């Protein structure tokens, strides 16, 4: 690793600087270096890791969607043949996206998940594993597409099982996991009813637990609850 010679604390410091500078590729490289030091991550460090890769892959996904849309329009009736370039460039972006997903999944498998014993860390990493398999599923078309989808489902399901046993219904990680697994059901697994049921049950169980929270925790939980409601409004 090109970060092997830099101190763990310096990598974390530079990840925070990269975030301030909106240099998310650098941020992700610094956090990958920090993970590869082999020590477990604190809550703030897990956040830095997730923010960095979410921004990198988010940009790739947006670009892939633009290119896929152009490619699909080129394959409609009456469209002038323009050669292999659109497919080639969509494939280039797709391959880079897959590489980033494989990198994140590799960090989770070697060895973040296996050392994560507390609910907050383990649920967080399993949510990430589901998310990055979900991004692989968005672009998948081959023999392994069903296995990629089931890998996302399996990671999300293990995270859900732990979160329901070990976290309150307002815990922001539990809420964000449910939000994303609901989107998985709607956009990946062709299961809109399950998506809607999960979002509604999650929202209602969080609502009933808000009374236990401080003002600051209430703000965190209600923010994610509003995203659940936003999706429900989009879907109904």
């Amino acid at each position: 690793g090109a970060m092997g010679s830099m101190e763990r604390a310096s990598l974390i410091q530079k990840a925070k600087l990269a975030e301030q500078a909106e240099r998310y590729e650098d941020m992700a490289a610094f956090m990958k270096g920090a993970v590869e030091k082999g020590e477990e991550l604190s809550n703030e460090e897990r956040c830095l890791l997730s923010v960095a890769y979410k921004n990198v892959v988010g940009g790739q996904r947006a670009a892939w969607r633009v290119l896929s849309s152009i490619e699909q329009k080129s394959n409609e009736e009456g469209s002038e043949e323009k050669g292999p370039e659109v497919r080639e460039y969509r494939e280039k972006v797709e391959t880079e996206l897959q590489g980033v997903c494989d990198t994140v999944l590799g960090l989770l498998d070697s060895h973040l998940i296996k050392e994560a014993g507390d609910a907050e860390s383990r649920v967080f990493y399993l949510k990430m594993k589901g998310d990055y398999y979900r991004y692989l599923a968005e672009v998948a078309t081959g023999d392994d597409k069903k296995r990629i989808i089931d890998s996302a489902r399996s990671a999300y399901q293990e995270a859900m099982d732990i979160s329901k046993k070990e976290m309150p219904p307002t815990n922001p990680i539990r809420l964000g996991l449910a939000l994303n697994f609901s989107v998985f059901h709607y956009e990946i697994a062709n299961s809109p009813e399950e998506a809607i049921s999960l979002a509604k049950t999650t929202f209602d169980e969080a609502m009933a637990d808000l009374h236990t929270l401080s003002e600051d925790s209430y703000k965190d939980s209600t923010l994610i609850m509003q995203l659940l409601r936003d999706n429900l409004t989009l879907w109904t």
Binding site: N180, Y186, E187, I224
Partner: peptide, 5 residues
């Protein structure tokens, strides 16, 4: 697209 975090 729907919201994810």
């Amino acid at each position: 697209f729907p919201a994810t975090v």
